[PDB]
Design a protein around this ligand. Sequence first.
Ligand SMILES: NC(=O)c1ccc[n+]([C@@H]2O[C@H](COP(=O)([O-])OP(=O)(O)OC[C@H]3O[C@@H](n4cnc5c(N)ncnc54)[C@H](O)[C@@H]3O)[C@@H](O)[C@H]2O)c1
Ligand code: NA
Lengths: 384, 375
Amino acid sequence: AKILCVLYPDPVNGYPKTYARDEIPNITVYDNGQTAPTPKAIDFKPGELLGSVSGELGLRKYLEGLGHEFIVTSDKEGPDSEFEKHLPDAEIIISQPFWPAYLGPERLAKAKKLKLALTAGIGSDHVDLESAIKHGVTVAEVTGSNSISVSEHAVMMILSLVRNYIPAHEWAEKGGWNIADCVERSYDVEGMHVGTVAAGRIGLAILKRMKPFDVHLHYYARHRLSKEEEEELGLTFHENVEDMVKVCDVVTINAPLHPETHHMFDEAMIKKMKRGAYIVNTARAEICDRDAIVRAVESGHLAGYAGDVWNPQPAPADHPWRTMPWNGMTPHMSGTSLSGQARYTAGTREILECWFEGRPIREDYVIVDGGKLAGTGALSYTVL
Amino acid sequence: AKILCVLYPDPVNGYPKTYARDEIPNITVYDNGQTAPTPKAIDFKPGELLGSVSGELGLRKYLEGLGHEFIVTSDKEGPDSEFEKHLPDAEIIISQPFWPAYLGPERLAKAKKLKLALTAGIGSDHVDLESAIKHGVTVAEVTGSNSISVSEHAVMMILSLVRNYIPAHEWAEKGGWNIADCVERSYDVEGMHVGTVAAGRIGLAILKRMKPFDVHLHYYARHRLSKEEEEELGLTFHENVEDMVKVCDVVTINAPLHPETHHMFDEAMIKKMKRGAYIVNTARAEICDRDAIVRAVESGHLAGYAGDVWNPQPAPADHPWRTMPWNGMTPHMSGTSLSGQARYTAGTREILECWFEGRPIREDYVIVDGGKLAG
Ligand SMILES: NC(=O)c1ccc[n+]([C@@H]2O[C@H](COP(=O)([O-])OP(=O)(O)OC[C@H]3O[C@@H](n4cnc5c(N)ncnc54)[C@H](O)[C@@H]3O)[C@@H](O)[C@H]2O)c1
Ligand code: NA
């Protein structure tokens, strides 16, 4: 069978021969009791660069050993791309959110042999789930694999926005000093009201990490956490997201992208926020209206926006989030820290072994199966 | 009476007419039970820029209303400065550690009317305390006021170094994507070993903020925290600093500068650190050897350095920490966030009220009481 795998390019000076450190931590379980991935074997050392073209998600020995054809490419745009060459007869397509091989209706119609679309990472919205359902394609992702990774990046971005880190760093790098320029919009986060959209793995991890900063914690969700978790973290629950955003100094977005969340943060929603509110969005770009965010930043309604997620991906060079005032953007990196990579790459392998051996994929990993949302997909996504 | 106040220059395009936000949080107490400042009244809105020349620590209405003269300047260097010209008949001298007006033995001998030397913030090393006592001078500062501010700056920098934030932000801003470039040295802090040099107000606050990142926490100090504090945070104590640095992925420095911390992080000590270790230093630059740090980030033995403290300070435009690979530096700023300024500026007013009304300055604020010791 053919496995078609789309990965991001190698570093500009080539695939690395050495790394900055010799080992990374061994993470075997997550906060909710879920085990980290359990492949029967791996063909990489945790800490290696796996998600680039030469890293191959450590899969080639395994797949070629079973006698399958394994195509690895970064070339994913348009009808002349290496991706579209192989789409018609791939049984399995793999890509990562950071460099996503989009599977819209037309591409899914063309993928005559496709049975499994695997997200190497978390968040399968680059696949049209309605069409995958129509064509009987199984959609799976490595649930939980990099949620902590993102939570760290999100807290980092909250503190950087609020404290005015990036402008101050630019003053230092350029040879300046300029204390008053550094601090004329530098604040402490202590005592601010901080709220999350969703309290799933990432949202909860962020709440826990923010707690000792002595902020006031809020969340919006469709269903509440246990009262014990609310009481331990001191959470205020809001039934309506509108009510939460009205009172928060900082809003962090941590929901999946599906019809309920698409453009949730549109012009009208942003207008309900406090003058000088911050948004951090490490979830998906299109939870926000792109140009509404720009207008609110430029007007000073929002004091700053930071996140690692964009639309489309890769983002064009002229994407307006790159240069909007006070932005703390990165490219889509948080879930593909080398640490995060180790876990989603192990889980990719775990899922494939299940698939080829005819064993059930973990329910946690399933988004679509047997012509419906299933497992995590039924809990956390919707279709119209 | 004359109050002489030295503050840092205004922002390059002028004192701000508007701010990013309308109000800031009202912080009333610190972790150790100390209350935040309690002036009877203030003539500023918390959130204003108070520490620059045009900000004036919001004191002018109050002081002029009492019939006093209030002189604000940023010009403080050497014998022909505005500071030195007013020094002889100032009763009260006010400056911040972010832009300190030095009061060494010569100056304190010239300051013939001086009764109160007030630090707006924390850090009065630029005041000679022995000379202040000889001249009957009270030295005071706003204890506790920006400890939390520094702790947030430090944790921010830890995360930024480990995750490789700043280089990735440069790729975003310049039109790139370059995920492999961004992440070929991007790690999670989860499960790493993080250690502090000292665990006073700032170090303890950092340890508490790092704890839910599920890092293994370590510290070195001259004296230990209580057993309950070590057990609450899951701390490993190291009686010698070398034993701590050998096992830490990240070292944050939160100690004073003295002969046994001076160039503590030199060539030999850095070589004992794990390959790819990170250092954050919001304490004093000279705890680290300047060129040793540069050589270690250039060789790859340290994977990053970040702080807002420099030697000399202000840093010269060509200081090598500015442009060394993988640095997370800022100018000196952590304790002069607008939030920190609100507290130490309220504390300045509180102290000045006590002074002019003949009430005691809070014990927590007094460094030396030359008045009392002169009797
Ligand atoms: N590198 C990255 O930036 C990165 C990495 C991983 C995940 N993500 C994004 O973050 C999302 C969340 O990841 P997670 O690991 O926390 O997933 P999770 O499934 O554990 O949590 C998602 C939560 O969102 C909730 N949710 C769904 N629809 C909602 C709605 N309309 N309003 C409010 N809450 C809603 C779900 O009920 C669930 O509690 C992913 O779907 C993905 O899009 C980004
Ligand atoms: Na819309």
